[PDB]
Ligand binder design. Structure first.
Ligand SMILES: C/C=C/[C@@H]1O[C@H]([C@H](N)/C=C/C=C(\C)C[C@@H](C)/C=C(C)\C=C\[C@H](O)C[C@H](N)CC(=O)OC)C[C@@H](O)[C@@H]1C
Ligand SMILES: Nc1nc2c(ncn2[C@@H]2O[C@H](COP(=O)(O)OP(=O)(O)OP(=O)(O)O)[C@@H](O)[C@H]2O)c(=O)[nH]1
Ligand SMILES: [Cl-]
Ligand SMILES: [Mg+2]
Lengths: 129, 994, 208
């Protein structure tokens, strides 16, 4: 009897954490939210390059997509013990690659410290590759 | 060159306007923006109305003509009465001519509905100005012109629909009372003729578009017309048969019949009752034969969402619920109507299965009505047994979490009534749904959760014995389910549901001590489970059970060696060791609830001492090491510990209130020393590092300590019983610790919670501390006013707390304002009017209330110099400021209290309760009454503020206002009429005689 | 595949804030009243491909109303907004609805009660019934907490495409480009980062 008739598939998730991401608007000299959701470190199984990929909750829209460059440095913000700021030279969340000053904030200091640990591990992976 | 249209000095280029318009509507980015600004300026140009005729004739672009009509509408609604009669007639004829022309061209009629509809609304705006006093022939001509053309007839139904809307549905806020009554009476007088035309079209009409348009107008008429037009003509029969059969008319017809069901109707008339039954029979028969039978799966249909099915089914739910809520007793009396009654309800059951939250709530409101009635009405429930049985399943399967407060409440109430009507049926349904979770056929987290919510919701409806057997059965079954499931994801879901259910059955817990003890001990074990949500649910369940069963923890239970609260306290360090701070605070709060049940004071204080042992020991060690070494407060970790100590005190004080005093006494003096120590560090850090310091984790942690100290003090004083101890022991150290600190910090370092704390103090004991209240004012008044008097946005919390504080001081300790220097009392009046000009209700409402209370306070003082001086200085400031906020259109939420205040001020004068003259000498005759001077002042003031009003308008308004100043609802009416008249030219002064 | 969406409602109800959050992800705390209208494209990725809303965010304050109903011409869908902390915003919903449907007779419309994040709610759930007879969808939303914040667009999209199974899906994530540090913009970076590190992040009391 005849019977009735994301582009992340190439990647391993090294780390996942809930975060709020901000971009600095120098024009207004103020921090602006870019998205809240899961921040993931994805290792491409072909190139072994690790990126940050972050998607807003509800819409699943990308608010961060960039290589974790070995040259980047996580720096504290004056207001927060659970956030890092860093310059990013090429983020393609909104299409064309652009530089940003990012700040990413977590639920706790432990999460922030863990993120930094993983961020550095990924930098080291991006150096060997 | 697009800005050429703004020239106006030159003739208007129409092809250029159509460019700008096209660019706006179709264009993009930068181009759209520029065209936008130009168009907006063009439209707002006050002489642009002159260009309308030119645009309407010579433009090709229908959007241009739309905007032209907007411009004309501005003229018609604001400035019409400035136009000569001849010009008003010329405009009127041009509009009418343009509509007829567009309707007589079938191509235009079909393709330009937006422009025609806009034209029709423009016509109706003219009718509102002109009709019927300056256009008695309008309706006869309209009725006449209908016979000429089908397009014109259809369009005339749109005009009549809009007119009915403007006169009866939207008149209340847009017209004076007198003008609305005039247009209502006018339409009513000519309705016989309008109805005749509408009935004729429906009786002998082939055009579905014309029939639908006519039925749309009828829907609007049904809002106001007498029932005889429906019941004493053939129209009911037409609506409930013919128009239900064709789907083009079905949607509007069902809406008409819903409104028919709401008509005011004779209650004691057998013919009318038979007619009411009959149209319902006819309607449901048409649905069952032409749309879908009673058995149809509406859930499926609705989900598929073909064509207009969703709206149809929404409208059918509205019709059935509306009709049955009014008429189901009609269908219950005769047994030949039983099938109709049950089929209608079966349709509702089917509708209630639709997966659409807002539709479900609509049906649920009806079910609540029904089952409430079956719970009380004699000899009814047996009719509905099968309806109710189905409904039990529908509600159980749709139960939401108690967090959805209103929906959960509605569902619970329905399910409680249903449970009472047949407990066995409810019980069987729940036990069988539980078996389908256990056998896996219906297992899911959503499904077990919803079922648990349902089971919890009917707590207290069964007899104690029936409930006992039911709960044991449920708990055994859920426990078994929890065993079955693999992995703690699944086990945690079931455990939380077990926790949920047990917490909803306190009667069972109170009868079964061993079980209750076991449950508590299990929650304690779960307070070690770090799996997400488990510790939270355990702590939340603990406090919930305590809130309901607290007595059982404070007595010594049979075969226990001590009250269980002692056992909880003994082991508290072990119990709470793995919890987050917020969870620990909940735990201590729950213990506080139990301890307040102990009414022996010595025992209660001992329990309180024992509960607070760990916070108190940590506190003591910190206080000793902190004061001996003030550096220790720099430590991030210490600041956190101190904050958590204070928060624990707040938690326990929250549940113990007055009983907390011994613990407060233990920490109070060192806590105020800590407040000062912490204050210094913040001030030090701000100076050393800048205003940025207030954002830093360390300073935020320090400020948290100060705010939690204030919260503790607020919490205790708000609940205190011994107010003598509050005044004699607590208040003076408090004011010393906080007031100078507040005043002497920079704005950005001042805590608004200080204001809130002081509000509580004045509220509770302000009568007993007159000198304390003065100190409060002197410390916070000017420096806070200076923070908030530059704009409406800065320092939002201070703004709100500031006017709350002034409000309670003005209510409790008015003498404190009598002590102010005149210049500071002037700032007080300025501060009150500043609050009036706020758009935030939190500040605006308090401002108006303080003014009314202040007036009352001044009135109380009687005929003394201060009161007489107050009126001479401030009466007219309050009257004029109130009028400003009344009339500027930016403060509409405040209308009611503005009106009350104005009424109070006016009544003072028209009762002669102000002894002295308000006018300064050399202003009016020496003998002039305050009444006469007030009239003169207001007339002059309104004339200046609103120069387009006539003297006659202003005089009539003021005459009305002063006569009505002891009748608030009428007074408010007069105010609203004025607010209408100030938006236009040539308002009728006789309106104020309504 | 694009649709004109008109957003209407009283001043201060959160129309612009809601749209801006959807456009950029930012939450604007300041109230800057819209002058007439702001038009912005908004794209969602669906299982039926991308859907574009041409969002006409109109002014709710009478003095900034601009073309008013002129903005509604050829709208294919609408959101009517009020603020559950302001009753007058709800009292004016029939007025907005009236003006809107007179120009757009047969379009899907969502009624949205914004600011459900605020604890002291003034327009209670049981008061909100206007949508029923008008066949509007209703959502409680919060532009601030993001409660239900995609729902208005998901519902409208389902109505417009005529597919009740339409889902929003994750927009594909292209592999990002490898970076090269320009030594000429070395001192510039330090300056901009210095400023960013010493400007405090907003809402440090929030969960994220
Ligand atoms: C009047 C009394 C009559 C009878 O009491 C019997 C028994 N004495 C009661 C035991 C009660 C308990 C063990 C507490 C229980 C009801 C509560 C919960 C939340 C149990 C949860 C699970 O067992 C633990 C779970 N496995 C752990 C996990 O993995 O989650 C992360 C029971 C039944 O026959 C009757 C009611
Ligand atoms: N608490 C809270 N505030 C909100 C929310 N959405 C917006 N707001 C704030 O409320 C105000 C709303 O401002 P807008 O979004 O510009 O209001 P609008 O409706 O566009 O105003 P008009 O353009 O004048 O019609 C701003 O202060 C927002 O930050 C929300 O969900 N919750
Ligand atoms: Cl009891
Ligand atoms: Mg706006």
């Amino acid at each position: 009897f005849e019977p009735v008739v994301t582009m992340e598939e190439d990647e391993e998730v090294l780390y996942k954490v809930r975060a709020k991401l901000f971009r600095f608007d120098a024009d207004a000299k103020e921090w602006k939210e870019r998205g809240t959701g899961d921040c993931k470190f994805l290792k491409n199984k072909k190139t072994n390059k690790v990126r940050i990929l972050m998607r807003r909750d509800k819409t699943l829209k990308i608010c961060a997509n960039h290589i974790i460059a070995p040259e980047y440095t996580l720096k504290p913000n004056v207001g927060s013990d659970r956030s890092w700021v860093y310059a990013c030279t090429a983020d393609i969340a909104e299409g064309e690659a652009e530089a940003f000053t990012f700040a990413i904030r977590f639920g706790s200091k432990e999460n922030a410290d863990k993120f930094k640990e993983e961020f550095e591990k990924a930098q080291e992976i991006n150096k060997k590759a | 060159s697009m800005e050429g249209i703004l020239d106006f000095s030159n003739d208007l280029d129409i092809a250029l306007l159509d460019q700008v318009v096209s660019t706006f509507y179709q264009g993009e980015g930068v181009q759209q923006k520029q065209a936008q600004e130009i168009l907006t300026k063009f439209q707002d140009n006050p002489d642009a109305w002159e260009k309308v005729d030119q645009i309407l004739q010579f433009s090709t672009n229908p959007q241009s003509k739309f905007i032209a009509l907007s411009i004309l509408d501005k003229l018609i609604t604001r400035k019409w009465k400035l136009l000569p009669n001849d010009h008003r007639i010329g405009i009127r004829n041009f509009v009418v001519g343009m509509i007829i022309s567009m309707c007589q061209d079938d191509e235009v009629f079909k393709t330009q509905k937006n422009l025609i509809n806009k034209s029709d609304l423009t016509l109706v705006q003219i009718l509102k100005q002109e009709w019927p006093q300056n256009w008695p022939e309008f309706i006869p001509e309209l009725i006449g012109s209908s016979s000429s053309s089908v397009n014109v007839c259809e369009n005339n139904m749109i005009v009549l629909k809009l007119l009915s809307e403007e006169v009866f549905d939207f008149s209340a806020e847009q017209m004076t009372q007198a003008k609305a009554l005039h247009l209502k009476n006018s339409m009513s007088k000519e309705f016989e003729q309008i109805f005749k035309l509408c009935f004729q079209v429906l009786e002998q009409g082939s055009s579905s578009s014309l029939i639908v348009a006519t039925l749309e107008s009828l829907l609007r008429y049904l809002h106001w017309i007498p029932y005889r037009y429906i019941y004493e003509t053939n129209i009911l029969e037409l609506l409930s048969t013919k128009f239900m059969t064709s789907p083009d008319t079905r949607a509007i017809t069902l809406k008409c019949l819903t409104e028919v069901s709401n008509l005011k109707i004779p209650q004691d008339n057998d013919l009318i009752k038979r007619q009411t039954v009959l149209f319902f029979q006819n309607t449901l028969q048409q649905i069952a034969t032409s749309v879908m039978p009673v058995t149809a799966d509406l859930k499926a249909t609705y989900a598929n969402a073909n064509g207009n099915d969703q709206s149809f089914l929404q409208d059918l739910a509205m019709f059935l619920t509306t009709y049955l809520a009014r008429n189901r007793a009609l269908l219950e009396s005769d047994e030949s109507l039983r099938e109709l009654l049950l089929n209608a309800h079966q349709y509702l059951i089917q509708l209630s299965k639709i997966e659409e939250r807002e539709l479900f709530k609509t049906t649920l409101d009806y079910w609540h009505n029904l089952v409430a009635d079956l719970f009380y009405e004699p000899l009814k429930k047996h009719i509905y047994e099968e309806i109710c049985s189905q409904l039990r399943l529908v509600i159980i399967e749709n139960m939401v979490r108690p967090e959805e407060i209103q929906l959960y409440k509605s569902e619970r109430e329905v399910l409680v009534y249903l449970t009472h009507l047949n407990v066995i049926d409810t019980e069987e349904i729940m036990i069988s749904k539980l078996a389908r979770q256990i056998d896996g056929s219906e297992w899911s987290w959503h499904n077990i959760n919803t079922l648990s919510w349902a089971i919890g919701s009917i707590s207290g409806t069964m007899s104690e014995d029936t409930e006992k057997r039911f709960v044991v059965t449920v708990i055994k079954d859920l426990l078994g389910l929890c065993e079955q499931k693999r992995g703690k994801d699944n086990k945690a879901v079931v455990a939380r549901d077990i926790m949920y259910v047990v917490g909803e059955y306190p009667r069972f817990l109170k009868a079964h001590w061993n079980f209750l003890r076991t449950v508590i001990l299990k929650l304690f074990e779960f307070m070690h489970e770090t799996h997400e949500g488990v510790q939270d649910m355990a702590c939340d369940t603990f406090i919930k059970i305590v809130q309901k069963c607290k007595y059982h923890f404070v007595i010594q239970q049979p075969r226990e060696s001590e009250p269980f609260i002692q056992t909880i306290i003994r082991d508290i360090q072990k119990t709470t060791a793995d919890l987050q701070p917020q969870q620990v605070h909940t735990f201590y709060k729950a213990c506080g609830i139990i301890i307040s049940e102990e009414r022996s004071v010595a025992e209660r204080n001992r329990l309180l001492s024992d509960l607070m042992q760990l916070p108190n020991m940590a506190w003591d060690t910190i206080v000793e090491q902190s004061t001996a070494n003030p550096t220790l407060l720099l430590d991030s970790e210490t600041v956190k510990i101190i904050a958590n100590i204070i928060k624990t005190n707040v938690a326990v004080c929250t549940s113990m209130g007055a009983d907390f005093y011994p613990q407060l006494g233990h920490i109070y003096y060192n806590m105020l020393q800590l407040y000062r120590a912490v204050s210094s560090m913040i001030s030090t850090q701000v100076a050393a590092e800048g205003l940025i310091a207030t954002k830093t984790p360390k300073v935020r942690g320090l400020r948290t300590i100060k705010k939690e100290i204030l919260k503790l003090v607020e919490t205790y004083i708000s609940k205190a019983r011994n107010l003598d101890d509050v005044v004699k022991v607590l208040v003076e150290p408090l004011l010393n610790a906080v007031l100078e600190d507040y005043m002497n910090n920079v704005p950005d370092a001042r805590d608004a919670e200080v204001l809130n704390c002081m509000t509580t103090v004045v509220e509770k004991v302000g009568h007993m501390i007159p000198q304390g209240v003065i100190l409060i004012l002197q410390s916070v008044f000017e420096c806070t006013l200076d923070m908030i008097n530059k704009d409406f946005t800065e320092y939002p919390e201070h703004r709100v707390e500031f006017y709350k504080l002034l409000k309670v001081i003005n209510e409790k300790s008015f003498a404190a304002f009598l002590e102010l220097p005149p210049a500071a009392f002037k700032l007080f009046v300025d501060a009150i009017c500043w609050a009036f000009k706020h758009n935030n209700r939190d500040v605006e409402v308090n401002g108006l209330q303080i003014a009314l209370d202040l007036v009352k306070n001044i009135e109380r003082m009687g005929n003394v110099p201060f009161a007489n001086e107050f009126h001479k200085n401030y009466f007219f400031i309050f009257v004029s400021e109130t009028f400003f906020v009344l009339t500027d259109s930016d403060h509409k939420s405040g209308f009611s209290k503005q009106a009350l205040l104005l009424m109070k001020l006016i009544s003072l004068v028209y009762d002669n309760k102000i002894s002295v003259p308000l006018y300064q000498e050399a202003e009016v005759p020496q003998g002039t009454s305050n009444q006469v001077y007030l009239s003169q002042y207001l007339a002059n003031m309104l004339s200046n503020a609103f120069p387009h009003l006539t003297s006659e308008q202003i005089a009539s308004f003021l005459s009305a206002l002063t006569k009505q100043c002891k009748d608030l609802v009428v007074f408010k009416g007069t105010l609203r009429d004025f607010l209408v008249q100030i938006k236009e030219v040539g308002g009728d002064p006789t309106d104020y005689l309504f | 595949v694009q649709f004109k969406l008109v957003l209407v409602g009283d001043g201060g109800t959160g129309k612009t804030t809601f749209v801006k959050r959807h456009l950029t992800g930012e939450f604007e705390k300041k109230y800057v009243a819209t002058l007439g209208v702001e038009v912005h494209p908004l794209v969602f990725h669906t299982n039926r491909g991308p859907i574009k809303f041409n969002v006409w965010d109109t002014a709710g304050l009478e003095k900034f109303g601009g073309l008013r109903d002129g903005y509604y011409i050829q709208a294919q869908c609408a959101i009517i907004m009020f603020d559950v902390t302001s009753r007058v915003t709800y009292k004016n919903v029939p007025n907005w609805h009236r003006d809107l449907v007179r120009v757009c007779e047969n379009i899907p419309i969502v009624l949205c009660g914004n600011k459900v994040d605020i604890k002291d709610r003034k327009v209670k759930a049981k008061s909100i019934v206007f949508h029923r007879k008008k066949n509007l969808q209703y959502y409680d939303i919060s532009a601030k907490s993001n409660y239900n914040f995609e729902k208005p667009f998901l519902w409208l999209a389902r109505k417009l495409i005529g597919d009740p199974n339409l889902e929003f899906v994750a927009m594909p994530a292209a592999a990002p480009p490898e970076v090269v540090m320009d030594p000429a913009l070395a001192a510039q970076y330090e300056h901009d980062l210095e400023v960013a590190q010493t400007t405090a992040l907003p809402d440090e009391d929030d969960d994220l």
